[PDB]
Amino acid sequence: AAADWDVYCSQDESIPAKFISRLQALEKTEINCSNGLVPITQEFGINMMLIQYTRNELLDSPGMCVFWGPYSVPKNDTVVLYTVTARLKWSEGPPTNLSIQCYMPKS
Amino acid sequence: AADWDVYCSQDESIPAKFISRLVTALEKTEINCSNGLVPITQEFGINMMLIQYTRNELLDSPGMCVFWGPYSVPKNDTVVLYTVTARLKWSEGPPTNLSIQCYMPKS
Amino acid sequence: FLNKAFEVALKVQIIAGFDRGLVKWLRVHGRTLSTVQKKALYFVNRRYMQTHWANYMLWINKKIDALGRTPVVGDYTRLGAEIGRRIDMAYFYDFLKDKNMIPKYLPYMEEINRMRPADVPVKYM
Amino acid sequence: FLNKAFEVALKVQIIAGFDRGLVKWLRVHGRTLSTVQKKALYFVNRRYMQTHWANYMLWINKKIDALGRTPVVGDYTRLGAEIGRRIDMAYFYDFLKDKNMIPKYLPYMEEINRMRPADVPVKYM
Ligand SMILES: *[C@@H]1O[C@H](CO)[C@@H](O)[C@H](O)[C@H]1NC(C)=O
Ligand SMILES: *[C@@H]1O[C@H](CO)[C@@H](O)[C@H](O)[C@H]1NC(C)=O
Ligand SMILES: *[C@@H]1O[C@H](CO)[C@@H](O)[C@H](O)[C@H]1NC(C)=O
């Protein structure tokens, strides 16, 4: 339930990925991105966030999250992997850690 | 070093096996593990490395690499993800990055 | 944490910026959308601010500290306006419309849409 | 970056430990293996040392720095022996046999197998 985020990956690095979530109280949500740790607040109901494949710290919009990667995967040269992880800290219970993976066709 | 793979176990008590086969310049290989940055030298021909799913700093063997994780995966409640990444530095050219992933069935 | 006047300045400008962008997008894409779909997108704006508030606050505090002086509300107005114009909400407007994912308009959304932008609740981290 | 006597002590003990482990494993699993498969596993020992020499050196240096005195060759003998017995190579022996992945025995492997353990080349990083 808490792990179920709706992940929409792109086919081109120029178009950011979209993630949507819907919502043992949840105290904190932090996305571990290549450009840093990005806090987000999951409000009751629907939440939306963009994740970029590319980084330009000078021109990027405030608070942007950028994927880690690209990574090569074994035995498969047609795609590369982009990923982030997220940590959800709860009032009661151990934190949960989730992995968000997006495969991109290789140019 | 185009030829490499990871062979995952079905039990957290049994480490995964990473095998690479190098033909031929590769200056450096670093594995980014939950317990640290682990250097390895990929010699001409076959190279092997164990990757543990569990960490005990007191009892683990010297130089052991431990996966990051476990991570929950969205929309898939039957498995969890363990992963490390590898960075390969070449004499000339940009470094290459590998994603080493193992899915473990859940209890 | 943050003085209320400052918070209000931020929220008013952020939501005003997002809304200007939505008006712009709707002039092109709004013809086939229902009234409730449009209201749902205005809610999307306010909710985007809520979701990303803590994350905007990091950037804001960074910007404020670089002033080399005590801030005034005008500083927060300017930064709020900058967030309001820089966030590209059209990535979501297009995606939601293209996939027929514009959310069904529900009471909690109407409630947030009926508030003054100054009163939209945000959570600091 | 390491005195040759120290390096030699390490390599001799590491390979001796790995080899003892392989003998123990072969008593159980060796019956159906060909001579060249067994030679290949003896090569796997030496190669594992080569591959992991750099991370062994981190561990070694950490241990040496904590000795509470300057080291002598015996310290490297001891640490080498600890590495030699603690690395669980049987995980690879079992995997390679079970999956029919025991490597094809090639000249570079024989060359490494014919060397003195003291002479197996290692790369510092
Ligand atoms: C982000 O996660 C990586 C593992 O993928 C970890 O090495 C790093 O410490 C994390 N970053 C922060 C800022 O906690
Ligand atoms: C490589 O993996 C991707 C997604 O993980 C998949 O679409 C593709 O088919 C794989 N490679 C081949 C040759 O099929
Ligand atoms: C390991 O990689 C993670 C990303 O997965 C990164 O956050 C971290 O800085 C890296 N750690 C080291 C020691 O380089």
Ligand SMILES: *[C@@H]1O[C@H](CO)[C@@H](O)[C@H](O)[C@H]1NC(C)=O
């Ligand atoms: C979950 O992931 C595993 C490994 O990636 C796969 O074998 C399995 O089919 C997946 N299940 C679902 C429901 O996606």
